[PDB]
């Protein structure tokens with residue numbers, strides 16, 4: 068949008084219950100400090116296995132947010 | 138399968154509730170007009186953020202379907 | 208970790224209900240024969256369509272597990 | 278947006294004057310037959326050379342447009 | 348070429364005898380409905396195995412063809 | 418250069434007139450807050466279409482800048 | 488298919504006569520020890536040159552086969 | 558074309574005014590020593606920043622040219 | 628780990644003596660300002676040549692660190 | 698092999714009869730001017746279509762050859 | 768080489784002292800159980816950070832080894 | 838820099854002692870015939886294994902050097 072610069076910061080979102088909740092936990096955490104959060108893009112789905120089970124879903128994400136002027 | 142040509146058309150499927158339902162909404166929509174839908178392949182998971190929440194899951198997909206003869 | 212070699216074997220996990228359960232079914236199956244399962248990485252989400260519905264979610268995965276000494 | 282399916286069709290746009298005009302010529306041509314054109318994504322910049330000059334800029338593009346119901 | 352838009356549609360071509368014949372079967376099938384077929388690009392070689400033999404070569408392809416005016 | 422750490426932050430630059438001006442708008446905006454801006458790398462060209470025209474060029478970019486000591 | 492895990496093992500198939508025969512030699516060799524061989528995917532075509540001729544076609548392949556229960 | 562070998566040499570073209578002129582400067586320079594220049598392909602767009610401005614556009618390119626017989 | 632968000636910031640580490648020391652110089656520099664540094668991932672190895680020698684090893688890196696609550 | 702530098706030059710090999718013969722025509726042509734040709738790697742398979750048939754197979758290739766001392 | 772099948776198994780090699788020693792530790796470990804080890808290919812360099820230092824270099828690797836007949 | 842064309846030639850550098858020395862051996866060899874060598878970029882790390890040891894490190898590299906006028 069009109070001469071807007073967008074910052075695309077990278078995070079890994081995490082949850083013991085799935086891919087989707089891992090993305091929601093990062094979006095939630097990101098919205099506490101960041102404004103004008105517009106789009107995400109999944110970069111990777113990974114995760115920790117413990118006792119032959121998935122202990123944490125780790126979803127990498129790019130968060131696009133609109134830059135406020137300096 | 139025996140001299141079958143397959144067409145691989147690209148779509149983005151969408152849902153307010155998750156990645157999986159976004160893929161089901163596109164498969165559903167695709168099956169209304171297309172026949173011999175055989176396989177999908179996820180090309181990207183993206184999505185819109187509004188008010189620091191995920192408003193829509195946008196899952197890119199290739200849909201492989203068997204071409205009927207001309 | 209200290210001079211540990213890790214083996215990264217590739218599998219496709221499958222489920223009729225979603226991406227997440229497809230990853231859990233492979234992790235479960237892998238843990239029956241393999242020890243020291245540490246991390247997974249999703250390589251692809253694909254799937255079979257039958258009657259314009261998703262019949263199986265097929266999630267490709269790398270499974271990292273720690274190699275026991277020979 | 279709310280349960281919208283998007284179709285992502287691929288084209289190469291062309292112009293004797295540059296990359297940007299090549300993208301505008303395809304968007305123009307695409308808008309003559311297609312409705313609800315929303316976003317493009319550049320897939321490749323290529324081009325023909327003739328007499329040691331660039332004769333045509335060929336910009337590959339994905340065009341995302343919203344699917345009307347069937 | 349001069350302000351020509353090109354459409355790049357994706358297909359999988361198939362044959363029981365090899366990669367090359369799989370590409371020829373798709374080009375043949377594509378030429379029955381499509382005009383101004385100019386170039387192809389191989390996107391993937393895959394295939395079905397049955398009884399420890401290759402039953403079908405499946406060669407993915409992009410077909411570039413020149414768009415006639417609307 | 419001699420034991421310099423460089424930070425590579427990601428932005429999307431935007432303009433209604435083209436790819437180049439979209440990169441200049443981000444470089445300009447980045448230089449208002451950042452010092453020792455050294456190189457950029459284009460990660461993607463995308464853009465919004467409105468009324469069958471390109472409304473904004475969106476050029477993704479990595480900005481390499483030299484880190485001042487902490 | 489219904490909660491089946493698939494193992495995707497990687498091999499390079501080889502032949503002095505071509506790409507296709509190199510894939511057939513690996514599929515043949517793989518079927519001597521492995522059961523439920525379902526699909527292959529070409530990862531790379533490489534090869535040795537000797538005396539300005541191609542001495543061996545080396546085709547990389549992923550072999551997907553269905554895992555029997557443990 | 559009929560048993561023609563093509564050589565694909567890689568260059569970075571440069572200009573203080575944009576992406577397009579950077580590609581034209583390389584094509585020009587390449588045509589002074591090379592014959593049968595047929596196609597280019599952009600491999601990357603990068604560039605130097607000086608005083609918070611873009612000092613040079615650096616466009617990577619593959620140049621395809623037809624090989625004359627030895 | 629349990630609902631932890633991880634930030635994945637990108638840097639280029641530099642050294643006149645090698646790839647490894649270039650990664651150590653960035654990790655060192657990063658640890659002066661950042662806490663809960665957990666993993667790195669090499670994105671690229673590049674470098675400057677001066678007088679036909681390698682003057683600096685430039686190793687790109689993603690640094691994963693655990694986000695403290697806001 | 699012991700402190701040998703290898704040069705990896707890129708070519709497109711061409712044939713009206715297939716992928717394999719296209720690779721043989723380039724290897725043949727390359728061996729007329731180049732010595733110590735060791736390995737090739739296929740970078741892409743493309744081709745021209747004329748009258749709904751494949752007129753030329755165009756196989757991209759990297760040719761690795763051992764550098765003689767200067 | 769003459770109708771040889773090669774198996775390409777994936778491992779992560781580890782060392783507290785660098786990238787190279789991490790590759791040597793995996794090659795060593797692999798040679799204790801595997802015969803006809805021919806080539807490796809680095810797939811990734813990653814690593815653990817502890818107390819703002821690199822605790823382990825983790826180098827991913829493909830190991831190509833020649834398959835003995837079944 | 839001001840209307841400079843840069844040539845990006847590809848080589849594999851080799852050493853029995855490591856990745857770094859393999860890059861230094863190629864840079865050294867390249868500087869005997871080439872002038873204005875400016876930057877390298879690692880394209881891959883591979884290597885030969887003999888007797889369960891690494892016999893040669895093979896580091897692929899792009900060498901960017903400034904083109905002198907024709």
Ligand SMILES: CC(C)(COP(=O)(O)OP(=O)(O)OC[C@H]1O[C@@H](n2cnc3c(N)ncnc32)[C@H](O)[C@@H]1OP(=O)(O)O)[C@@H](O)C(=O)NCCC(=O)NCCS
Pocket residue numbers: 074076077078093096097100101134137450451452453482483484485486632634694
């Ligand atoms: C929020 C944000 C976009 C603001 O960007 P900005 O407009 O450049 O503003 P900043 O406040 O970062 O200003 C630049 C700062 O870096 C400093 N700086 C500038 N150039 C520098 C250099 N070469 N080396 C070191 N520091 C430098 C400035 O002095 C200033 O610091 P100061 O406030 O201590 O003086 C940016 O801080 C950011 O991208 N944050 C990431 C947030 C994130 O990813 N959160 C994840 C939540 S899940």
Ligand SMILES: CC(C)(COP(=O)(O)OP(=O)(O)OC[C@H]1O[C@@H](n2cnc3c(N)ncnc32)[C@H](O)[C@@H]1OP(=O)(O)O)[C@@H](O)C(=O)NCCC(=O)NCCS
Pocket residue numbers: 144146147148163166167170171204207282284344380381382383412413414415416
């Ligand atoms: C269904 C489909 C496979 C049929 O393919 P097909 O066998 O080639 O049949 P088509 O009906 O497209 O025939 C080609 C048409 O394009 C025209 N055509 C052929 N060459 C052309 C060219 N160079 N320029 C312009 N038009 C051309 C033909 O004249 C014909 O149009 P007409 O019916 O108006 O005469 C194809 O239409 C398709 O791929 N659709 C995409 C569906 C999709 O992705 N849906 C998403 C749902 S989620």
Ligand SMILES: CC(C)(COP(=O)(O)OP(=O)(O)OC[C@H]1O[C@@H](n2cnc3c(N)ncnc32)[C@H](O)[C@@H]1OP(=O)(O)O)[C@@H](O)C(=O)NCCC(=O)NCCS
Pocket residue numbers: 214216217218233236237240241274277492494554800801802803832833834835836
């Ligand atoms: C478990 C595992 C890591 C053990 O690795 P290892 O330490 O090398 O031990 P192995 O038992 O495989 O030993 C090597 C075997 O291959 C043989 N071998 C060695 N080199 C060989 C060659 N060039 N050609 C053929 N066979 C060879 C050895 O003789 C031995 O076989 P044997 O027991 O019949 O004598 C390995 O078997 C593995 O990676 N398995 C994959 C498991 C998997 O992916 N499961 C999926 C569950 S979802």
Ligand SMILES: CC(C)(COP(=O)(O)OP(=O)(O)OC[C@H]1O[C@@H](n2cnc3c(N)ncnc32)[C@H](O)[C@@H]1OP(=O)(O)O)[C@@H](O)C(=O)NCCC(=O)NCCS
Pocket residue numbers: 170171172173202203204205206284286287288303306307310311344347352354414
């Ligand atoms: C516009 C578009 C999205 C409409 O998609 P849709 O909702 O699926 O509707 P369509 O009419 O295309 O598809 C149904 C048609 O395909 C046919 N079809 C369905 N399944 C089929 C199969 N397996 N094999 C062959 N044909 C099939 C149907 O019979 C029907 O043909 P008909 O119209 O002759 O009855 C689709 O045509 C499209 O993607 N077009 C591409 C536009 C483009 O790229 N333009 C470029 C401008 S620069």
Ligand SMILES: CC(C)(COP(=O)(O)OP(=O)(O)OC[C@H]1O[C@@H](n2cnc3c(N)ncnc32)[C@H](O)[C@@H]1OP(=O)(O)O)[C@@H](O)C(=O)NCCC(=O)NCCS
Pocket residue numbers: 142144204310311312313342343344345346354356357358373376377380381417
């Ligand atoms: C041939 C082709 C290029 C023609 O493209 P075109 O110039 O855009 O012409 P179309 O006939 O597709 O026109 C657009 C159609 O989609 C409709 N349409 C346009 N925008 C739409 C939207 N947002 N949602 C749904 N439908 C839409 C139009 O109403 C029109 O349908 P109609 O014929 O029922 O009126 C296109 O049909 C195509 O790409 N086909 C694929 C062919 C193929 O892959 N064949 C495989 C052979 S192996």
Ligand SMILES: CC(C)(COP(=O)(O)OP(=O)(O)OC[C@H]1O[C@@H](n2cnc3c(N)ncnc32)[C@H](O)[C@@H]1OP(=O)(O)O)[C@@H](O)C(=O)NCCC(=O)NCCS
Pocket residue numbers: 072074134424426427428443446447450451487660661662663692693694695696
């Ligand atoms: C400028 C920049 C390089 C400075 O980096 P730096 O040397 O690490 O300095 P910072 O000021 O970021 O210091 C780290 C801060 O994060 C905090 N921090 C450190 N580790 C942390 C963790 N694990 N969790 C949460 N916060 C943490 C520190 O407490 C400090 O915050 P404070 O200022 O409230 O004390 C950095 O701010 C940056 O990369 N900014 C992005 C600029 C940008 O992209 N601008 C876009 C312009 S278009």
Ligand SMILES: CC(C)(COP(=O)(O)OP(=O)(O)OC[C@H]1O[C@@H](n2cnc3c(N)ncnc32)[C@H](O)[C@@H]1OP(=O)(O)O)[C@@H](O)C(=O)NCCC(=O)NCCS
Pocket residue numbers: 240241242243272273274275276494496497498513516517520521554557772774834
């Ligand atoms: C066939 C195959 C799928 C069977 O997988 P599986 O169900 O996991 O069963 P396996 O017997 O291989 O794995 C268990 C073995 O690994 C061992 N193992 C388990 N975890 C381990 C670890 N962390 N470290 C070392 N060894 C381990 C077990 O002790 C057992 O060894 P044993 O048989 O000596 O008791 C698997 O062997 C495989 O992937 N083979 C590759 C086949 C191939 O690539 N063929 C090429 C032909 S061209």
Ligand SMILES: CC(C)(COP(=O)(O)OP(=O)(O)OC[C@H]1O[C@@H](n2cnc3c(N)ncnc32)[C@H](O)[C@@H]1OP(=O)(O)O)[C@@H](O)C(=O)NCCC(=O)NCCS
Pocket residue numbers: 564566567568583586587590591624627730731732733762763764765766842844904
């Ligand atoms: C133009 C070109 C295709 C000619 O290719 P060719 O038909 O192989 O002809 P060449 O003249 O290169 O012949 C091979 C040369 O390398 C030598 N050579 C062959 N094998 C060799 C080896 N293994 N080690 C070292 N030298 C070798 C030959 O002896 C001969 O050199 P000579 O002329 O000193 O005897 C080639 O020079 C080229 O690709 N140049 C790049 C042009 C370029 O990128 N320009 C940039 C403009 S912006």
Ligand SMILES: CC(C)(COP(=O)(O)OP(=O)(O)OC[C@H]1O[C@@H](n2cnc3c(N)ncnc32)[C@H](O)[C@@H]1OP(=O)(O)O)[C@@H](O)C(=O)NCCC(=O)NCCS
Pocket residue numbers: 100101102103132133134135136422424484634636637638653656657660661694697
């Ligand atoms: C440390 C870090 C994770 C903290 O993230 P955080 O929890 O989001 O907290 P921050 O303080 O950075 O972000 C909020 C700031 O950005 C601002 N901000 C939020 N949304 C914004 C927007 N849309 N536009 C501009 N600024 C915005 C806030 O106003 C606040 O600025 P303030 O501190 O001046 O009030 C983050 O600063 C970071 O990623 N730093 C990079 C460190 C790095 O790369 N170091 C390299 C060492 S080698």
Ligand SMILES: CC(C)(COP(=O)(O)OP(=O)(O)OC[C@H]1O[C@@H](n2cnc3c(N)ncnc32)[C@H](O)[C@@H]1OP(=O)(O)O)[C@@H](O)C(=O)NCCC(=O)NCCS
Pocket residue numbers: 562564624704706707708723726727730731764767870871872873902903904905906
């Ligand atoms: C064969 C080859 C490896 C020889 O490499 P080499 O050892 O560097 O030897 P060269 O003869 O190229 O020596 C460098 C030449 O470039 C010149 N040169 C060096 N640096 C330069 C610069 N920065 N700008 C312009 N020219 C430069 C030298 O002056 C010399 O030219 P000259 O012989 O006119 O004096 C090289 O010519 C090559 O890679 N050719 C490609 C072959 C090919 O792809 N063939 C296709 C067959 S299908």
Ligand SMILES: CC(C)(COP(=O)(O)OP(=O)(O)OC[C@H]1O[C@@H](n2cnc3c(N)ncnc32)[C@H](O)[C@@H]1OP(=O)(O)O)[C@@H](O)C(=O)NCCC(=O)NCCS
Pocket residue numbers: 212214274520521522523552553554555556774776777778793796797800801837
């Ligand atoms: C060594 C190796 C190449 C031998 O391959 P091979 O020639 O296929 O021989 P295998 O011994 O694996 O034979 C296949 C086994 O899997 C079984 N099998 C075959 N198809 C199967 C299927 N669909 N499901 C489950 N098991 C199957 C066979 O019954 C046989 O098991 P058995 O020994 O209990 O009878 C193979 O074991 C391998 O790739 N190992 C990995 C070694 C490795 O990565 N080591 C790391 C060192 S760092």
Ligand SMILES: CC(C)(COP(=O)(O)OP(=O)(O)OC[C@H]1O[C@@H](n2cnc3c(N)ncnc32)[C@H](O)[C@@H]1OP(=O)(O)O)[C@@H](O)C(=O)NCCC(=O)NCCS
Pocket residue numbers: 590591592593622623624625626702704764844846847848863866867870871904907
């Ligand atoms: C050094 C270099 C940049 C010079 O580039 P240049 O300015 O184009 O100069 P060249 O000398 O290559 O001139 C082009 C040559 O190819 C010939 N040529 C031009 N077009 C041609 C075509 N289509 N087919 C065949 N030959 C052609 C010219 O006739 C001339 O050869 P000649 O000297 O025998 O007359 C180029 O030789 C090069 O890139 N070399 C690679 C060096 C390298 O990789 N070294 C490795 C060191 S580790």
Ligand SMILES: Cc1cc2nc3c(=O)[nH]c(=O)nc-3n(C[C@H](O)[C@H](O)[C@H](O)COP(=O)(O)O)c2cc1C
Pocket residue numbers: 323324325335558561563593595596597621623709743755757
């Ligand atoms: C691998 C390959 C890629 C090509 N890519 C393009 C391209 O992107 N744009 C284009 O106009 N022509 C392309 N061509 C066609 C050539 O530009 C050229 O017109 C054709 O090879 C005939 O040239 P010749 O007469 O020199 O053989 C390509 C050809 C080959 C073999």
Ligand SMILES: Cc1cc2nc3c(=O)[nH]c(=O)nc-3n(C[C@H](O)[C@H](O)[C@H](O)COP(=O)(O)O)c2cc1C
Pocket residue numbers: 533534535545698701703733735736737761763849883895897
């Ligand atoms: C980077 C690299 C890649 C290679 N790839 C292959 C390959 O794909 N197939 C092959 O048979 N040999 C390959 N080789 C081995 C070479 O073909 C050759 O036999 C070896 O370098 C010895 O050659 P020399 O005696 O000319 O040094 C490769 C070597 C290197 C350094």
Ligand SMILES: [Cl-]
Pocket residue numbers: 382383384
């Ligand atoms: Cl025609």
Ligand SMILES: [Cl-]
Pocket residue numbers: 452453454
């Ligand atoms: Cl400055």
